[model samples]
Target: QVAVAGNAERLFNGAWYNLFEYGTTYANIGYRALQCQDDMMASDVVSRPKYGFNSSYQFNDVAIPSDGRTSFAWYLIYKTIDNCNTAISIKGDSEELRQAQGQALALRAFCYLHLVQHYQFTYLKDKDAPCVPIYTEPTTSGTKPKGKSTVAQVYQQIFDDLNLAQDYLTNYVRKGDGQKFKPNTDVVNGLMARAYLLTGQWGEAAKAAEAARKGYSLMTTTAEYEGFNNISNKEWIWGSPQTLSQSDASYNFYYLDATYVGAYSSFMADPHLMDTFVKGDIRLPLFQWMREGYLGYKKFHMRSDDTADLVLMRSAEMYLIEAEAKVRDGVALDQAVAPLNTLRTARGVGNYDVTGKTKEQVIDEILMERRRELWGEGFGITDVLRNQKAVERMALSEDMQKTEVDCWQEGGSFAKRNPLGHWFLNFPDGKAFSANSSYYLYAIPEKEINANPNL
Candidate 1:
């Protein structure tokens, strides 16, 4: 077998190109299971739990397999989608084995679109909900033993593997360390404009987020905004670069937003996401200033080189998904307030004439500038669970609402005294939902219902 046809260019750069390498540990198992679902819906963030002092997943104590923090994100995203379906059934030939089988079918459609958005249901009001369990063959061929998949058939197999990863990464381009880790074709049209803006498909998610914001721009205030832990930030449209010579930079999220000396730091910064930043907002230097009376952000601090690049996609989220899909398709709120005042005059703030507002105040000023431009880096409960809204979390720092414990001081704000008020993380089968629950989904994880009984 002529040495098994030269190990198909050694499995296209080995282990399918180190499965989109980002300083490793299988690139933090599907991005730390999406940073534990963005720390249970980023009301800024909280959840110290390196397992010191009881353990708090914060807000309604984030349950079900919270032990070993949600069973290592459903066992490392089904072992990285069974190592990208056993390297899409081996067999290969030139063109770098068909561009490493189109980057392992766009990394198994980005691990089934982050395991169907943390176990499914936001393909615009639960398009037949069910969710997560659609392995595309090869658990070594034997097959059978499947079951869940209907957030519109796992978003049509995540846009038919991102339109077959844009027909195998259209004229692929990569020069050195596979530039921004791979999946070109403008990151498969910005992951099909983030799955057509989470399936509402607003005008094909503003024409695939305006063709993935052309040649990317935006990242100013003299570029290097301290500790965003840059992965060559030129408004990075795809990321993953943490590396303290591979120690994996103190297991990132700057091990919960840094403060230098052996940080346990444990995420903070949410005085209503910092009273929605005002003064000359070059993103108000990502919060930083901790020491008990908390508030630290420095976008995954670990500043400069201990490492912190997990951004994933940006170009300011494809110009806020092409200005919230042309202001939710009322056709064009001034072409959706021109890229929301060109990303607020390139982030030095000052620039807004969403003229004659009202289209629900121009979609509430593009959902409050997508919570001060995607705060805390994890789409804060994915733009309130794809606008089926109802969150409420904010108000807790009048010095941790007057020294923590039982914290809910009436009108002087404070909430999160536990799943407290507003709500809508959705539910489905095991019932209980409201916040106009056309069902927002997320459940199927009791070890994938006792190891799949055709779950």
Candidate 2:
């Protein structure tokens, strides 16, 4: 990340600062990190095929599976850390630059955390699961790469980064006009919580999520409904606001016109999800639209970019996290449900006066509600894996077949503790690893890895 601030940096680094104009070389790392997240999230396999189809082969080819894609996601994360290192090394000495430095560190942490998820199974899967390669010192020779770290070690670093970011980023105040282009303490906290959650630190995750959520509120009210066509809303914790770039396919995917659905072949909707909404609820109409007598997600484009906001964090998630955390044994603890109900009430779905459910029950309800609220916001894939409930939930469809092994089973290494558990990975095109060795990782493009051995 330091290289970006170096005198010899290409204009690429400068251009990126415009996106995170609390401008500095290192913090731009955080901004650039979002590009990877956005791309990976919207990437076809990660979203469409893998998610649309069962957790298995969502795409047209078997050469690409869920594990492969997960590895590719790791590759992109390294690219992000590489940026952070360059930015930090070359960074200038200014207030924004200082904050940028913290952002760089935080982003590096984010990359490592995701790498753990992509390259290794959850701690529940195997305490010994390998973590993604971790690069600290900037590579000068760029001649060698490292092997995977253990789950414990990888999470240790993740925890370390969150703490360090927490300390360094405390005083940052974006001294710029663009509110959308900055990462505040809240963003850092959200990242921390998410990182903690990946390691199964549910209470910590809940606390951090709640803290970050408290830092902001759900962008409620019709006045707040800026369409997803653009990233103008306040709900974005720290994200790139670029909607489906007109030049890219997203413009069609995001727009309200019926033809965009046609371009994609079919207007697909999950029967499980369609059952959650109240007929007149305000949230119901956002992702809903009629296309040649078909019902699907087109109304999101109904308004201008003025309506949608691609979220990094929203008050609703914090509420859901709190709801889940507050659950004690079999109790739904009203403290947590209060937030869930708040969100429900805003959507005009009955009231926040909810009850008659256990802690797990409430959590399951919250997860389903998240499916409803955060569905197209780019979450389903990991959400399913994170909670370890894929097969029974229909994450594996008829296309998934009766695989005897369980996808989300608790096991040793890659062994199955549950026969039906299966975890899918649709690797990046060809940039993670040699296809054979990359089942647990992505296909790092030969061109890039070959050119930069340290990759």
Candidate 3:
């Protein structure tokens, strides 16, 4: 019995660690391939074949079941879910054990949330759509193979688990700053807010987001916004800290941070995205010109030894959620834009006047603000899917065309230029996918279909 309790505690710890391990594949699917962050091809022959540009699953391309990255991602998420289930199923009366169970439950809900979003359309689009199977109990040899659940059913399980987590973690206090890696009551509420926002539960999203960001504050200066590497940032509500021994070298920093010379540095930002920012906004300078006339973001940077923390949830996101939800839920203009203004003011671009703007205009402004505030945080494709928006990349201006031509003349490498005229546009089928195209959704792994009898 003592051994079982100890193992449960270890499972809880391992569950948190495993979440960090899953960041690489999650970033690959969400950030790189889904067009959140554009990938740059290697400059030389040796680095050429190692890039995602050669993969069939490039931006806006259909991801088949056989894709290794997608397969690995599916496997990692279920592995974390299994760990959570083991921790949650352990029976105990101690406070420590109950808190572990609460964290496990929250982690499990997080996994399902990601799984459902990746595998099917949004809940509002089709609640009855087939989603991934739910597993509340620990997997064992006797565990039966399960079939798909409805999107609605998966969300129901997510909310139920979160509610139970809130109850169990009611009196739990994290040990210290380092333990921010673990979920507390506030983190659970943030998760609830994210789930509500995705499902279009506006009033609930507003309330949950407000509660989630109650204690945390946003960054106030340009310096604070530049290096998104630290987990100790005040606005960060939930994040995964990385040590040298446990860092994900391939995806997290290596791909995202342009300053890391030893990295693949495949990720870059669209120049048009930089054009959207206002003059005094602190986030503007983070997007700078890189080699080959492309813009590489300085928003993410690595340490001297090449490791950085991964941000999962933050208060700035909650503020945007609250603002958007209020407007969408038919609240008054002033009230709806309040949170938006608050965040903008902190970022040194506040005092937005929405006095004469229509409701739809206010909502559009909030969405644009979301794009600016939440870039490179894994919300790109999901945001498009949730809002039912088209996957259109901005066309290059004449100045950009001139720049590209000039760079090529100056011996700059343009090995795999996106012929569609934008850095991020890679629709291999010759056009962008429509808002309702099923190709945007990831396919179920072939290995899973082969192994699970009920699949």
Candidate 4:
């Protein structure tokens, strides 16, 4: 058996990176959730039933719970939790081992956060809703059956882990600069900021984000912008490094964006989302025209070898979190707007004009900018839930499922360009879900229900 205390760091990294780390495995969950939301639509040319492009609104379907993508995510997340428990269970004397314990706790908390958000409901309205069972101790005996907890309890556990992470990492300093791939103090703070923001703890969110982004700066030059796929960017806080060593086994952003061996452009950007960017804006380069109507992504397809790493959290997210938290608190408009302007200017978009605007108005613009910047990075549903708003689908065209809709010409208003794009990727049955419908929350998988009598 692996020496528990001696292998704490290795075990922590294992949990952080095992399976696919931030590659298509994450893309399967996070990217699939984005497609489930309004930002992306499935390609009209192909039929991807496994991804649920056709039955997105039918929550009871097999795509989410029984499907390989989500089941992979759920399985690996539990494996990560198990790794954390095993590491934390062993007592250690060295500070390095202690820091490893801190990372284990933080990683476990993050996995729980992801599971609660997707499997159950948002913390906003589903505070008392059933989340996954808590399993802080290792499942060594294979006989310890667990029961579910409320979403509120899950959030409390997350906060507890984060607070402990903060304390445990206080004296820890990284030995190697290359360990940027791992979660450190900055990652702890960034995760705390995200947690607080998601749970509506605005003041705590702002403070954590401010501290998280203390030493990082935005990429300024063309070279830096193009290096987004690489982990060398200073803006990145935590990531999974995909070096040439693992490139042979790794499937990542390129597999989704490129047409080299096979085409995975089966899911592309919504034209309405595409039209929102101005021609001169630097954000336009992130997308490339796959065909007349379809837009393929470039940010994730940066390298020819497809060895680019996966960036989990970054300094940019922290800055945005800080701006949002401050604005929502209604006390620091001046402070809030600064980071927003800084981010916009760095993106080559002009600074936002916040003069005489209500805090609510400025926040709406901030959210819009967020959509533009974080388009395919997989935060769409969370963004919708964060604002407690409904996704107002544009009217659907005729032949709902496989119809190829036309995008706008160069100049048009954001509304006119939408063309009533299909909700849930043009699912023919999506019309059953009205705007702001309670069914906006997806249902739990039947398999989970059958397996867990406690639920």
* lDDT by candidate, in order shown: 0.60, 0.49, 0.73, 0.63
Report the lDDT of model 4 for residue 56. Answer: 35
**Per-residue C-alpha lDDT of model 1 across residues 215-318, encoded as one tens digit per residue:** 77887673365556666777776766656664343354535554655656555555556567778777676664344444555555665555566667778878
| TM-score (all chains, Cα) for each model | 0.31, 0.69, 0.89, 0.82
lDDT of 2 by residue, 58-150 (tens): 222212333333333444456556666665665365555556666776766766765565444466667686555667655567537775568
Clashes of each: 0, 57, 0, 2
Candidate 3: worst 10 consecutive residues by lDDT?
40-49
Judge candidate 4 at residue 140 and give its lDDT: 80
Q: What is the lDDT for 15 in model 1? A: 38
Candidate 3, 138-216: lDDT as tens digits: 9998998799999999999999999999998999897866788788999999999999988889999999999998789
Q: Which window of 10 residues has the lowest lDDT sum in candidate 4?
A: 40-49
Better of 3 and 4 by TM-score: 3
Q: How far does residue 108 in candidate 3 sit from its true spot (Å)? A: 0.4
Worst 10 residues of 1 by lDDT: 417-426
Query: Between candidates 2 and 4, which one is better according to lDDT?
Result: 4
Off by over 4 Å in 1: 1-36, 39-63, 66-76, 100-102, 105-137, 141-182, 185-214, 219-272, 276-278, 282-312, 315-345, 349-373, 376-455
